[PDB]
Amino acid sequence: VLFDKATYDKLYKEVPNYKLITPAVVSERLKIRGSLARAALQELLGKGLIKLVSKHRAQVIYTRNT
Amino acid sequence: RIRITLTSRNVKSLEKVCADLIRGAKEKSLKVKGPVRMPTKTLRITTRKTPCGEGSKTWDRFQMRIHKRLIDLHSPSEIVKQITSISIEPGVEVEVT
Amino acid sequence: QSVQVFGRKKTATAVAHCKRGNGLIKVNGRPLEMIEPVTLQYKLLEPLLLLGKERFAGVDIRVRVKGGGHVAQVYAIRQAISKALVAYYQKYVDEASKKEIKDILIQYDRTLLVADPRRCESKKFGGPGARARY
Amino acid sequence: VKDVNQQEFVRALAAFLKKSGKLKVPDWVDIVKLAKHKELAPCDENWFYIRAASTVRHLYLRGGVGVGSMTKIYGGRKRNGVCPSHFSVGSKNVARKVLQALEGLKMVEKDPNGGRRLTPQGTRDLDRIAGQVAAAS
Amino acid sequence: EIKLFGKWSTDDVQINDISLQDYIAVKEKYAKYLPHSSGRYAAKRFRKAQCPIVERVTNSMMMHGRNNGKKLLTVRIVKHAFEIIHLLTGENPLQILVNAIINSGPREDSTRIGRQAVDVSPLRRVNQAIWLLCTGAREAAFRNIKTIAECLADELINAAKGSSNSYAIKKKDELERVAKSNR
Amino acid sequence: PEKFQHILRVLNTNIDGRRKIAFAITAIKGVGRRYAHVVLRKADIDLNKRAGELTEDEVERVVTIMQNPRQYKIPDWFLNRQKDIKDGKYSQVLANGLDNKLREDLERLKKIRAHRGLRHFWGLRVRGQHTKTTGR
Amino acid sequence: QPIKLARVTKVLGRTGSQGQCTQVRVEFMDDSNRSIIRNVKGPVREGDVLTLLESEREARR
RNA sequence: CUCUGGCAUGCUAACUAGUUACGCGGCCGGUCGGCGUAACUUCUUAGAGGGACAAGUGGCGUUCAGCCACGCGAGACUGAGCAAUAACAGGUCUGUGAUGCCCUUAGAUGUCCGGGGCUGCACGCGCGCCACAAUGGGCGGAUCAACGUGUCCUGCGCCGACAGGCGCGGGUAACCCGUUGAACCCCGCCCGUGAUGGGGACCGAUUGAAACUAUUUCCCGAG
């Protein structure tokens, strides 16, 4: 469900700029599947562009670059 | 040692022959263990009241109390035969071992 | 030289044994801060952050719980570690502080020191539960 | 095995039994559905090592179990679709093939009582993993 | 010793409303670490108002049959709900929660007799605003990728300034316009 | 990205590539959740990918095992055509014989005038279900 | 028109067909005037506060 | 009034119930387990006897009957049972060696044989099961009940994937099942603008003498 590079480069710059970084809110702004919006968002956590503040069994919330 | 159990249906007659047994045994200077209070067992039988299919689903709750009391006694059996014949009352069952 | 005070929820009876050590709070051998209901984590740490960290550093209590359910055992633990602690302050220490700990627990939560008389009443025929009637 | 996270302990203990490839690991039982009340096979590839670590964990807590009561530990709620869901035992052969595997590792002993307490070596390896997971946090 | 929830407190963010001060339990007298106490609040008449507002929302969210008798499932919902609104809005979640509940309590409602609408009890407001805000997050996220905890945070940000988009805000103005019709 | 397959035509049936592997092959009749995961567990195929994520080699390797499961260390009690009355050969019908194999056995019951075959011809409950209130 | 606030001073009794309404007299706090009675719905006791949107009518029963 | 339940660290007793004290079992004496008869009973059981009566304060009241709010407190307290003068043409002749009468009474208005009687074009009740995954299904953890029954309940060892099967054992029971490892729930991962991993409709074993009109159970398919 990974869209073209135009959506990927925007995710590398815009979704870290979001205040509430969540696989549910990014799916509404970029049309990403519920899995890839959560799976591909883990790479940004490994790069340090986002911070994982809560990772529950059925709840995942990330914060801005701070 | 002899362990005599007391299984009865009424508690008033159970503790009476139980107290009358230990008093008749302690007077002979015998080592009697305390009366162990076995957990009582109630016999629940939920039977429909009406002998037909007419009613408001009214049930009848029956019960039956079963009390057991353990009494141990380390003494010769010749001194306990007459003691078991003085605390016999209807309603309580005596089991000498 | 020890007091065993029980905490009774619906059916969970938690008896706490009180001894003195250096920062050891465990229940059924397992540590108190690592019980399965991670949601009810502060409920077990409830008599810790309002009673005094320095007043809770030299106390070692090991609880043994049985009966009830998951949440009922949680409230049985905090009922055991709280009452068994006050019983130590009143039997081995003075009452000047035994009433100090008593007042801070009551002003926050009464059920932290008084068990609830609420139990599951008997079911009646004609309905699914006690009062409902299908 | 206590004093640490019981979920992270079995996650670490399963990796210990994976490195030491000395378990039984049957040919067909390792690719079938685990329990009757289950819907599909375990999604984890090394599921047999996770339950193995969980089996020694319960024997460390409760002894004299045997394969008859082990399936009760891993029991769950069976989905009957239209009938009310009930409880059922997990599996007898999975518990049997996982118990005999640990006896090969000299971790569990046999007894007429059934599945007696862990061997001194079985208890030994459990605390060692319990110390590693504590140091990791 | 401020008796926080572990993450948030209620200092310098006190209630700006001067009507519901008694039936909004925020201060240290009712503050708690976790909104879960089971202290027999539904026994007397007004003893339910003594319950903190965070715990009442937890008891009000567990509804719709399936999630009834599941409080641990609901505590984590409102727990994450306060963290998400604290991220969407830099303000404290308890400050906006008070702002979300004061802007959702029906001021006037029609009492069908026989029709008449005069006023609403202050406890009836908090009893309903909590029910409005809880049902505001239930129906708004049913067939949605947004979880219930995320949907609860949206109920607070829109109710702070009165964005009229929350399901609770769309019911307060409805109860006020119908109340004016029968008056 | 590249190498991604939108549709995977397997057994002359369109299989979506947007979803995962072990649940997109389930669109084929005859293979469900249990059989799809086993044939992907025997073969060295990672299940944590999308259907279009695979290549032309893995897709061909799947159908080789599904057509002959017993030849890949798969037991007999796992198939949907165990101990056929006609030939007695265990096989796995996949959306092409399942429409016919599960059709000729019903006709087998009608040709012998069996009660189980008559109710299918009439269109009623055959397994003792009380059609007095259901089957409407 | 400016909004006025008032504190519940005394509960009179239950009104309405189903008895859900509670006739309660109120009194303004800022300006001492218009100690008029109003009709309230729900649990009402002595000491409550009613944000009266108007100050014109009594609306008895 | 009676049996229940809420407390009584006060009493009477417990190897058919247990904890608690230090010693042989591993780890880092601490920290956790298993195995043996020393003290007594918090925890368990059941006996006796207490405790709670609108008793205390405030308010409202023929300042009576009481009622309301506060304290103190295990509760300001609840759930059963037995239940009147009677009535109904409301059910029971198919609950009886309860019964009157009548019909049927040896080609029988007692049985019984494999059994037939588990039956549908739509309307009706009550009830289980999710839907309208998103608070759910899944998978793997992890972790807590209670009444009641047991000559049948079931414990261990071989072996099926599941359902089963075989030998060896305990228990007529606070003794064995049994510390009744119950589910929901808790935690990790997977799924995701979708009739989807939602929904589970409809299409080999066991019980017995015997399951066809699937008794149930399981497997795969089935949607």
Curated annotation (Swiss-Prot), chain A:
Interval of the full protein contained in this chain: 47 to 112 of 124
GO molecular function: structural constituent of ribosome
Subunit comment: Component of the small ribosomal subunit.
UniProt GO cellular component terms: cytosolic small ribosomal subunit
Signal peptide: none
Originating gene: rps25
Superkingdom to which the source organism belongs: Eukaryota
Keywords noted in UniProt: Cytoplasm, Ribonucleoprotein, Ribosomal protein
Source organism phylogeny: Eukaryota, Metazoa, Chordata, Craniata, Vertebrata
Predominant place of localization: cytoplasm
Its biological purpose: Component of the small ribosomal subunit. The ribosome is a large ribonucleoprotein complex responsible for the synthesis of proteins in the cell.
The protein's name in its UniProt record: Small ribosomal subunit protein eS25
Subcellular location as annotated: Cytoplasm
Keyword Repeat: no
Family statement: Belongs to the eukaryotic ribosomal protein eS25 family.
Ribonucleoprotein among keywords: yes
Curated annotation (Swiss-Prot), chain F:
Disruption phenotype: Embryos have a reduced forebrain, kinked tail and inflated hindbrain ventricle.
Subcellular location: Cytoplasm
Biological-process GO terms, alphabetical: regulation of cell cycle; translation
Gene Ontology cellular-component annotations: cytosol; small ribosomal subunit
PROSITE patterns: RIBOSOMAL_S13_1 (PS00646), RIBOSOMAL_S13_2 (PS50159)
UniProt superkingdom: Eukaryota
Keywords: Cytoplasm, Developmental protein, Ribonucleoprotein, Ribosomal protein, RNA-binding, rRNA-binding
Alphabetical list of Gene3D superfamilies matching this protein: 1.10.8.50, 30s ribosomal protein s13, domain 2 (4.10.910.10)
GO molecular-function terms, A-Z: rRNA binding; structural constituent of ribosome
Entries under InterPro entries matching the protein: Rbsml_uS13_C, Ribosomal_uS13, Ribosomal_uS13-like_H2TH, Ribosomal_uS13_CS
SUPFAM superfamilies in the cross-refs: S13-like H2TH domain
Family: Belongs to the universal ribosomal protein uS13 family.
Primary role: Component of the small ribosomal subunit. The ribosome is a large ribonucleoprotein complex responsible for the synthesis of proteins in the cell. Plays an essential role in early embryonic development.
Subunit structure, interactors included: Component of the small ribosomal subunit.
Name of the protein in question: Small ribosomal subunit protein uS13
Organism: Danio rerio
Phylogenetic lineage: Eukaryota, Metazoa, Chordata, Craniata, Vertebrata
UniProtKB/Swiss-Prot annotation, chain G:
Swiss-Prot/TrEMBL keywords: Acetylation, Cytoplasm, Endoplasmic reticulum, Nucleus, Ribonucleoprotein, Ribosomal protein
Main location: cytoplasm
Places the protein is found: Cytoplasm, Cytosol; Cytoplasm; Rough endoplasmic reticulum; Nucleus, Nucleolus
Source species, domain of life: Eukaryota
Keyword match Ribosomal protein: yes
Pfam families: Ribosomal_S28e
Transmembrane segments: none
GO terms for cellular component: cytoplasmic side of rough endoplasmic reticulum membrane; cytosolic small ribosomal subunit; nucleolus; ribosome; small-subunit processome
GO biological process: cytoplasmic translation; maturation of SSU-rRNA; ribosomal small subunit assembly; ribosomal small subunit biogenesis
GO MF annotations, alphabetized: structural constituent of ribosome
Subunit and partners: Component of the 40S small ribosomal subunit. Part of the small subunit (SSU) processome, composed of more than 70 proteins and the RNA chaperone small nucleolar RNA (snoRNA) U3.
Function: Component of the small ribosomal subunit. The ribosome is a large ribonucleoprotein complex responsible for the synthesis of proteins in the cell. Part of the small subunit (SSU) processome, first precursor of the small eukaryotic ribosomal subunit. During the assembly of the SSU processome in the nucleolus, many ribosome biogenesis factors, an RNA chaperone and ribosomal proteins associate with the nascent pre-rRNA and work in concert to generate RNA folding, modifications, rearrangements and cleavage as well as targeted degradation of pre-ribosomal RNA by the RNA exosome.
Family statement: Belongs to the eukaryotic ribosomal protein eS28 family.
UniProt-listed PANTHER family: 40S RIBOSOMAL PROTEIN S28, SMALL RIBOSOMAL SUBUNIT PROTEIN ES28
Protein name as annotated: Small ribosomal subunit protein eS28
Organism: Danio rerio (Zebrafish)
